[PDB]
Design an enzyme around this catalytic site. Structure first.
Site, PDB file in Angstrom:
ATOM      1  N   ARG B  34       0.858  -1.187   0.000  1.00  0.00           N
ATOM      2  CA  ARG B  34       0.000   0.000   0.000  1.00  0.00           C
ATOM      3  C   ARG B  34       0.890   1.231   0.000  1.00  0.00           C
ATOM      4  O   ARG B  34       1.816   1.350   0.818  1.00  0.00           O
ATOM      5  CB  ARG B  34      -0.928   0.004   1.219  1.00  0.00           C
ATOM      6  CG  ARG B  34      -1.674   1.290   1.489  1.00  0.00           C
ATOM      7  CD  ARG B  34      -2.714   1.089   2.570  1.00  0.00           C
ATOM      8  NE  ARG B  34      -3.350   2.341   2.972  1.00  0.00           N
ATOM      9  CZ  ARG B  34      -2.954   3.120   3.973  1.00  0.00           C
ATOM     10  NH1 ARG B  34      -1.899   2.801   4.758  1.00  0.00           N
ATOM     11  NH2 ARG B  34      -3.594   4.278   4.206  1.00  0.00           N
ATOM     12  N   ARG B  75      -6.225  17.560   7.364  1.00  0.00           N
ATOM     13  CA  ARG B  75      -4.946  17.263   7.978  1.00  0.00           C
ATOM     14  C   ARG B  75      -4.225  18.533   8.350  1.00  0.00           C
ATOM     15  O   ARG B  75      -4.441  19.601   7.747  1.00  0.00           O
ATOM     16  CB  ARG B  75      -4.055  16.429   7.072  1.00  0.00           C
ATOM     17  CG  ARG B  75      -4.772  15.354   6.232  1.00  0.00           C
ATOM     18  CD  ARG B  75      -4.679  13.998   6.828  1.00  0.00           C
ATOM     19  NE  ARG B  75      -4.869  12.909   5.890  1.00  0.00           N
ATOM     20  CZ  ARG B  75      -4.366  11.696   6.106  1.00  0.00           C
ATOM     21  NH1 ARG B  75      -3.628  11.396   7.211  1.00  0.00           N
ATOM     22  NH2 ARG B  75      -4.577  10.701   5.244  1.00  0.00           N
ATOM     23  N   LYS B 221     -13.151   2.813   0.977  1.00  0.00           N
ATOM     24  CA  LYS B 221     -12.846   2.798   2.394  1.00  0.00           C
ATOM     25  C   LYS B 221     -14.081   3.204   3.185  1.00  0.00           C
ATOM     26  O   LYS B 221     -14.583   4.298   3.015  1.00  0.00           O
ATOM     27  CB  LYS B 221     -11.680   3.718   2.695  1.00  0.00           C
ATOM     28  CG  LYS B 221     -10.389   3.212   2.093  1.00  0.00           C
ATOM     29  CD  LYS B 221      -9.308   4.280   2.063  1.00  0.00           C
ATOM     30  CE  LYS B 221      -8.849   4.652   3.464  1.00  0.00           C
ATOM     31  NZ  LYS B 221      -7.660   5.528   3.443  1.00  0.00           N
ATOM     32  N   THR B 282      -6.176  -1.363  10.308  1.00  0.00           N
ATOM     33  CA  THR B 282      -5.902  -0.369  11.336  1.00  0.00           C
ATOM     34  C   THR B 282      -5.691  -0.922  12.763  1.00  0.00           C
ATOM     35  O   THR B 282      -6.606  -1.412  13.414  1.00  0.00           O
ATOM     36  CB  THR B 282      -6.954   0.752  11.315  1.00  0.00           C
ATOM     37  OG1 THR B 282      -7.020   1.276   9.984  1.00  0.00           O
ATOM     38  CG2 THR B 282      -6.578   1.857  12.247  1.00  0.00           C
TER      39      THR B 282
END
Ligand SMILES: O=P(O)(O)OC[C@H]1O[C@H](O)[C@H](O)[C@@H](O)[C@@H]1O
Ligand SMILES: O=P(O)(O)OC[C@H]1O[C@H](O)[C@H](O)[C@@H](O)[C@@H]1O
Ligand SMILES: O=P(O)(O)OC[C@H]1O[C@H](O)[C@H](O)[C@@H](O)[C@@H]1O
Ligand SMILES: O=P(O)(O)OC[C@H]1O[C@H](O)[C@H](O)[C@@H](O)[C@@H]1O
Ligand SMILES: [Mg+2]
Ligand SMILES: [Mg+2]
Lengths: 483, 483, 483, 483
Positions: B34, B75, B221, B282
Site C-alpha cells: 500500500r 490534515r 474505504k 488499522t
C-alpha cells in the site's frame, strides 16, 4: 443503552491499592476483584479485601473476591545488579549450582532442579511471559546453556516456561497450601488454581479448601498443553470445577499463539455446556498500561469475547500496575455494552433435542425459553439459596435481566461473576408466605426496572430453607394482586 | 501446515523503503503493498513501486500495488522537525496563516480556511484517529488556541476532526485528482478512495481513473458514519466498488469504537454477498511498532478477522514506520495460518435457496460445491482473462486452493488480494487446443501441489480470447490422458 | 401444468390385452408395462411385449418392460365342493396328512411339510392375500386347529402366509428359473424378484440372468418381514439390486398394515440414498377396478407417495383386470402432476456435508445443484451410455427436466422408470465432434422444450464410446454459436 | 403400543343406531359422534345423542357430540315420472326456463338464475354427489347442453355442482338456522358449518348459536374454493372458528383432486399455528362400507393424516351406513397407533424465534418444551376450566400424555377431540388448597399411568374459579410430599 451483562474482573496491585482508586474502580463497575497471590504480603491482601467489600457496600454493589494461587510457576533467581539486558545471539545459562543472589550477564541461578532434567537441546524457553526467548544449545547435569533468539531485559524472579509445555511440576506447592488457608480465612468467594492438568489437581485443591473450612468456588485456569490435548482432558477438568479461565498468557506459550483463537472458543463453549462460569483473560487491553485509550485490536478482542459468550473479561496489569486503571475498566465496560446489542447476544437455540438431568435445571431452562419468546417479560426473579438456579439460567443466550434473590452474602457475591445476573438481597422465609411475590416485585419497582403493565417470571421451590429444590415457574403481571 | 489463504496488505514507508527490507517483506509473504499518498513525493512512490515489482518477480511472487488517496479528510501541515510530543495541559495552536513547513512545539499550520468558522470555545479536537485530544480555549481570526487533554506524538499531515463532526472538505480533492493520474501512470492494481459517502463518489473516481487510462480496481474505504447509516447506504457504496476496506481508525471516530465489532462483521459479509473483495485494517498489531511480538489481543483481532472471512488484513505503521516491519508480517502470516485450520473456515452453505444471475457465476459456484464435497479434488485450475471467475469462487468458504491461470500481468497481480487464490502465469491461446489441459496440470505438478492420483477441477470458456464467457467445468484425474 | 415426472407402472392382463386398449394406455402415459409371470402363457407375454414396444414406437414413447417372477407361493389344497364360506368364530383345520383332493367345511390339506414345526399357538394365518384371517388355537402332530378372525370365502389353491413370516421357502423356484430365461429371451428391461430375504437371493438371480444373456436390471420386491427386520437387512438387499419395490400387499400381511407407513418411507429414502430406483405398489387405486373415479384416500395415497419422492407408482388389478384401466392411468397421472407442484418436490439440500465417491457422481450432483439455483436453466442434456449418470441426477429433488441422450435401446427404455428423466435418442459418436452440442440442443428445439434465450446444462465425458467417464459440465445459451 | 393420541370422529346413521352397535363403537374407541343433519329426524338425533352419552358414561369414556349442518345445495327441479336413467354418451339439458315439474329423459329444469353465466363449454357437472357426471357441450341463453360421461339414475331435487365450484349460495340456509336451535337444545359440544366462505359466515353462525343459548364450539368445514383462494382467506376463516375440518369430498370437487394433498397439509398446519383443532375427513376407509378390512391406500391415507399432525380422523358412511362400522373404527384406531410411533410424531421445534401473545399460552408452551426435554416427565396435569390451556399444549408435537382436569361436563367432552388429551374429572375448588397437588397425582396413580419415582408437570392459575388465568408450572416428583 441497557445494563451491561458481561462481568469485569480487575486485578489489584500497586496502582489500585489506595482507597481513592478502589472507590473509583467500584464506581466504574468492577464485578470481581482478583488478588494475585504471586505478589504481595498476606496483610496487603487482607487490607485490599476489606476495603473492596466496604466500598462495594457503600455504593450498593456486590463485588466478589477471587484469590489466584501462584501454582508451580518456575522462576529464575536474583541478579547482582537487579536487572540485565540481553541481545540476540548472546549466550546465557540457567544453573542450579549458581548462587541465587549472584546473577550476572552470563548466568542466573534457578531453584528448580527438574527444569534441567526435562529440557533438551533444541528446546525454546520463554521468559517474562514470552518477552525474551532462548534456545537450549547444550545440557549438563546442573545447567542449560542457551542462545538468545529474542532479546530484552531480564530481572529477579521472572517466569520461565518451555514452548510446548511438558515440564514436570506438582499442581499444589507449599506456598499454595498456605494461600488456600489464607483464602479460607478471608472468606474469598472464588479461588483460582494455576497450571492444573486434570480433574485430580482440582479435586486435591477442593479437598484442601474444604479442610480449611473455605466456602469458595473453584476456578480452573486453562494454561497447560495437556489440559487442551483433547476433549476428554478439557471436559474432565471443566467438570471438576465451578468456573474456568482462558489464561491466554501461559496457554499461548504452551500451545502457540496461533492456536489460541480456536481454543478460546472451545473452552467457553464447553464450559457453558457443562454449566460452568468462564472468564477470558490476559492482555485484553495491554496498551492501556501506558495510554488512556485502547487500540482497535483491543476493542475487537474484548468485543469478540463477548460474542463468544464469555461470562467475564479480565484485566491484569492494566488495573494492577498501569497508569490508567480506572479508564481501563470504563473502556472495557463500554465495549461490552456495545457488543451486547448484537443480535447473536440475545437469540438462543434453547438446547433443543437435548436431554435434561434435573428438575431445577428444567425450570431454569424453561424460564429462559419463556422469557426469550414472551417479550412482555422484562425480568426474571429467581429466588435462590446458593445461586445454582441463576447459574443455569445464565448459560442460555438472552438479553433478559436475571435477578438472584438471596438472603446469604456468600450467594450475593458469587453471582457477581455470572453473565446477566444481578443480586437483590431478599429473605423470603422471614415474610408471610402470601406476601412474598409482591415483596419481590416491589424490589424491582423500587429500582425502576419494571413498571405497572410489565410481566415478570418468578421461580422458586416449595420451602424457603432447603437448597436444590427449585420446581416452580410463575408468570406475573406487575399491577395485579399477586398471591 | 497448509498454504496461507488470507492475504496481507503492508503499507510502505521510512522503515520499509530500502531494497533490503522490501526484499525481506516479499520473502515474509506480503501480497499487497500500500502506497499512502498522504505522505511521500511522487518519485518516492515510483521508486518503491518499481522496487517491489522487481523483487517480487525475483522471487516468483505476485504482489499487487494499492494506492491510497488522501481524500477530504482534514490534515495538519508539516513540522520543522518531523514530529513533536505533547503533554496533558500543554498549550497548542492551529493556524491558517502559520508557515506550512515550520511547525513547532507550540503551533502548526493547516490548510482549512473555515477552521475558525467551524470550531468554537469548548469544542474538542481529535487528532491521529483520536490518539491526541485537545479542547479549544480561545478563537482568533486565524487560529485556534488549545489545551491538550490527552497527550501523545504529532507529526506531519496527521488527521484532525471535531467531536461534533463539522470538519470536512467537499467531494474529491485536487490533490486526489492529481494522484489518480499518478496511479494510472504507475499502472497501479488497486486505488482506494477515502471518505466516500455513496455510490456517486465512487463513480466519479472511476470516471477520472478511466479518463486517465487507469486499469486499477477501486477500493471503497468505509470510514464515514453516513456510509453505514443503513443497509441501503452501505450496499449502494459496496456495489459501486470492486473492493472495500474496513477502515477502523476513522470509522471508530465517526461511529464510536463500541460499535465497530458489529459493523466490521456486517461490512465483510455484505461485501462477500455482493461479490466484492474486503480488507480489514488499522491497529491490528500496533504494539509491534515497538515490540518484536504481538499482544494476545492483537493475535485475537487478526484471527477473528480471518474467521469473519475477510480477504485480507492490513498493516499501517507496523510495516511503514515501526521497528519490526518484517517480524510483523511474519507474525500476521502465522496467525492467519492458525485461524484457517478452524472448521468454520472450510465449511459452506453454498448459497442454498438463492438465485444466480449469470452463467460464469454458476460455474464458479458449481466448482466450489464440487470441490467442497469430492475430497479427492486438490486444486482448482481456473483459466481466467480478468480474474472475475476466481473472484466468485473465492467468495465461498473453502480450503481448496484456487489457481488463477492468466496471461495478463494486470490479472496476475489483481488476484493477489483474493483470499485463497494463487497466480499461475499461463497463456492457453498460444498452445495447441488439445494440449491445454495437460499443460495446466503440468504447472501444478512442477510445483508439487498435486501428484498422480489426485483429482483437479478445470474451468474455462469456449474461446481463449474474450472475457466473461466461463461456461465449462471439468473434473480431471492427474495421470490420465487429458484432452 | 408441467410434464409429469413421477413414472407409472401398469400391470397387463385380460383387461389390457387388446391392441386398442394398449394403444390407449400408451397414450394415457404409461412408462412401464409389468408382465406378471404368475399368470398367462409364455406366448401371451411375448405377444403383449411385442405389442407395447410397437405401439410405444408408433407414438414416440419409451416404455420399459418389467417381468415379475412369481416366487414361492405356499398354497392350500382343494375343496370337495368348489368353494366354502367361513364366519367369524368358526373352527377350521389345516392338515398335512388329510387327503389333498377333497377338503370339507372343517378341514383342508396342505403341501407344507414343516407346517407344525413352523407355526404355533397364537400365530395368525392370512389366506387369499389377507381376505381371510385365522388364529392357531391348538397344534397337533399333523395339523393346526384354528379359529376364524375374519370370515369370507376360501377356494382351491389359495395362498397362505403367517403374520411375521418365518415360513420356509426359497426365493427362486424352478418356475422362476425358467421365467428368468424367458425374460432374457424377450430382452426385458427389468426383472423383479419376489420374496427375497437378503443380498444372496438377489446375487443368485443376477447370476442366472447373466448366464441366460439377460441385460435387464433387477428389482428387489420388499415383501418379507426378514427384509425389513433392521437397517442392515434392508440396506444389504437394496445394495444388491438396481431397483426396489415397496410391495405393500405381501409386506402388509407379513409386518401388519399399521407398520406400513413408516417402512414405505424408509425404503424409499434408503433406496435413493444408495442411488437405486424405487417403485411404490399395490391397491393405490383399488376402487377403480369397479368405478370410473378414485376415492379421496386413493388420491391421497398416490400423492403422498409422490411427496415421499418415489420414482414410480404402480397399478395391478386396476389396469390388468378392472373395468376402467385407461381411466385409472389417467387419474394416477393427474394426481402425480398435482403433487409435483408442491414446494417440497423441487427443493433439495444437495447432500451438503456428505462425501462423494466418484467423479461421474460429482458431475451429476454438480449439475443438479447448478440447475436448482440458476433458474434460466430449462433442461439438462445428459449424454449417457448406460443411463448411470441420469440415475444419479434423478436422486436429487428438483423440477428441472433431465434428458437422457443415448444411442442404445437398452438405455432408452431403462430410464423410463427414472423420476423426471425423458429419453432422447441420439448418437454423438456418429457426428463431427464440434457439431454435437448444437445437435443435442436441436433435439430440444424440435420438441419445443426450449427456445432461444433459455439456458441448458450439457454433461458428457471425453470419448463417445466408453462408459463410466462422465466428467464435464457445460452451461450453454440457446441461440449462441455452440462449439 | 402406547395409548392412541389421534382422535376418531364416527358419523352415526342406520348402521349405528341400535344400543348394541353404539356400545360396541364406544368400546372400540370413538372419541366424537357426528350427527349429520342432512338426514334423519330431530328425534332420531336426540335418541342417538342420549344413547351415546349414556353408554360413554357407562364405560368411563368422554365422547363429544358434533352436529353437522347440511348447508347449501344447488338442486335440479322435478321429473314427470320421478326418476330417469342415463347412459354414457346420452345428451341431456339443464334449463332455467323448462317447467319445474315436467322433467323428461332429455331435459330438466333448475331454479338457478346465473346458470348460463357460471358454467361454460368444457365444464364438468356432478350430480347426486358424483353419481352422474356430465360435460357441457353447448351454452345457450337459457340452458346447458351436455353429454353424459358417467351414467346412473337422476331423480327430483338431486344436487348439482360444477368442477371448480363458484356457484352462488348462502352458507346458512333456513334449515341450518333451525338445526342450530336444535343443536343448542341438545347441548351439543361441537357444531360444524358447511360451505362457509369467510369469517363473516362463521360470526353469523356464532351469533345464532349464542342467541339460542348454545355453548358449542364451532367447526369451519373447508369445502369452498373461495376459502382456500389465498392464505388471507383461509387464515381469516380459521381465526373465526374453534376448529376446522378438511372436507375432502366437496373440497375436491371445488378445487380438483390433484390439489388436495397440498391443501390438506396447509389447512392442518395453519389451523395448528392459529391454535385451532383440525379434523381430516371423507372416504378415509371407504372400502370398509362393504369389506371387513381396509385397502393399503386407506391405511396409508389415515397414517399420513396422522403424520400431518391432524387432531382427528373421521368416518362417514363407513360408520353410518356400512356393513362393518365397528371394524372400521377398530382398524382406524390401530393405524393411528402405528403411525404415532414414528419419530416425527414426538419431536417439535417448539415455535423457536416466534413471539407469544398471552401468559397462559406461555405456560402451555413452556410445559411442552419442558416435557419434551426432561424424559422423567410422564404426564402433564393441566387444571383447566374451559379446556383452553390443554388446547395450546396439544398444538405442539409430543408423545407425552396431556390430562385435562376439569369439573365441568362441557369441558370434559370438548377435549375429546384434542389430540393427545385425556379427560380427568376433578374439582380443585372443593378441596383444601394444600391437598390439591397430591389429589391430582392420585388420579393418575389410580389409573396406573404413573408410579412412584416418575415426574409430572402441573399447571394452574391462582384461583380455582376464574378462567383464562393459567400462570404457573410446577414439576413434581411422584412420591415426595406435595404442597
Ligand atoms: O438450588 P438453589 O438456587 O441454591 O436455590 C434453591 C432454593 O431457592 C428457592 O428460592 C428457595 O429458597 C427454595 O425453594 C429452593 O430449594
Ligand atoms: O475469468 P473471466 O475474466 O470472466 O474471463 C473468462 C475467460 O477465462 C479464460 O480465458 C477462459 O479460457 C475463457 O474461455 C474465458 O472467456
Ligand atoms: O452415463 P454412463 O452410463 O456412465 O455413460 C457416460 C458416457 O456418456 C457420455 O456421453 C459419453 O458416452 C461418455 O463420455 C461417457 O462415458
Ligand atoms: O385453561 P383455561 O380454560 O383458561 O382454565 C384455566 C383456569 O382454571 C383452572 O382451575 C386453573 O386452575 C385456573 O386458575 C385457571 O384460571
Ligand atoms: Mg482514514
Ligand atoms: Mg360437504
Amino acid at each position: 443503552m441497557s445494563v451491561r451483562r458481561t462481568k469485569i474482573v480487575a486485578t489489584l496491585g500497586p496502582a489500585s491499592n489506595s482507597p481513592e482508586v478502589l472507590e473509583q474502580l467500584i464506581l466504574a463497575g468492577i464485578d470481581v476483584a482478583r488478588l494475585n497471590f504471586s505478589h504481595g504480603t498476606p496483610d496487603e491482601h487482607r487490607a485490599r479485601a476489606r476495603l473492596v467489600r466496604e466500598l462495594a457496600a457503600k455504593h450498593g454493589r456486590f463485588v466478589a473476591l477471587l484469590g489466584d494461587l501462584q501454582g508451580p510457576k518456575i522462576r529464575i533467581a536474583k541478579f547482582a545488579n537487579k536487572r540485565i539486558e540481553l541481545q540476540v545471539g548472546d549466550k546465557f545459562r540457567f544453573s542450579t549450582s549458581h548462587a541465587r543472589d549472584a546473577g550476572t550477564q552470563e548466568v542466573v541461578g534457578i531453584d528448580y532442579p527438574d527444569l534441567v532434567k526435562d529440557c533438551g537441546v533444541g528446546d525454546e524457553l520463554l521468559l517474562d511471559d514470552g518477552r525474551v526467548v532462548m534456545v537450549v544449545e547444550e545440557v549438563a547435569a546442573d545447567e542449560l546453556r542457551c542462545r538468545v533468539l529474542i532479546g530484552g531485559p531480564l530481572s529477579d524472579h521472572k517466569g520461565i516456561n518451555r514452548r510446548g509445555g511438558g515440564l514436570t511440576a506438582p499442581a499444589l506447592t507449599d506456598k499454595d497450601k498456605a494461600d488456600i488457608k489464607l483464602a479460607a480465612d478471608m472468606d474469598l468467594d472464588y479461588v483460582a488454581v494455576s497450571f492444573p492438568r486434570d480433574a485430580k489437581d482440582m479435586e486435591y485443591a477442593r479437598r484442601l479448601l474444604t479442610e480449611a473450612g473455605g466456602k469458595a468456588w473453584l476456578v480452573a485456569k486453562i494454561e497447560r498443553a495437556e489440559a487442551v490435548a483433547d476433549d476428554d482432558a478439557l471436559d474432565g477438568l471443566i467438570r471438576a470445577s465451578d468456573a474456568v479461565m482462558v489464561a491466554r498468557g501461559d496457554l499461548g506459550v504452551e500451545i502457540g499463539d496461533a492456536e489460541l483463537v480456536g481454543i478460546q472458543k472451545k473452552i467457553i463453549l464447553h464450559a457453558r455446556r457443562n454449566n460452568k462460569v468462564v472468564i477470558t483473560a490476559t492482555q485484553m487491553m495491554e496498551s492501556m498500561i501506558h495510554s488512556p485509550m485502547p487500540t482497535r485490536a483491543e476493542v475487537s478482542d474484548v468485543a469478540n469475547a463477548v460474542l463468544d459468550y464469555t461470562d467475564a473479561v479480565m484485566l491484569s496489569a492494566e488495573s494492577a500496575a498501569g497508569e490508567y486503571p480506572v479508564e481501563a475498566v470504563k473502556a472495557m465496560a463500554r465495549v461490552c455494552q456495545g457488543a451486547e446489542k448484537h443480535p447473536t447476544s440475545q437469540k438462543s437455540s434453547h438446547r433443543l433435542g437435548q436431554t435434561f438431568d434435573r428438575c431445577d435445571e428444567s425450570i431454569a431452562l424453561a424460564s429462559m425459553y419463556t422469557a426469550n419468546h414472551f417479550p412482555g417479560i422484562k425480568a426474571i426473579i429467581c429466588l435462590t439459596e446458593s445461586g445454582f438456579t441463576p447459574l443455569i439460567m445464565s448459560r442460555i443466550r438472552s438479553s433478559v435481566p436475571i435477578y438472584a434473590y438471596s438472603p446469604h452474602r456468600e450467594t450475593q457475591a458469587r453471582v457477581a461473576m455470572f453473565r446477566g445476573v444481578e443480586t437483590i438481597p431478599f429473605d423470603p422465609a422471614a415474610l408471610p408466605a402470601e406476601k412474598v411475590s409482591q415483596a419481590a416485585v416491589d424490589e424491582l419497582l423500587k429500582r425502576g426496572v419494571v413498571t405497572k403493565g410489565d410481566w415478570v417470571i418468578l421461580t422458586k421451590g416449595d420451602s424457603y430453607t432447603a437448597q436444590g429444590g427449585t420446581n416452580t415457574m410463575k408468570v406475573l403481571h406487575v399491577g395485579d394482586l399477586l398471591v
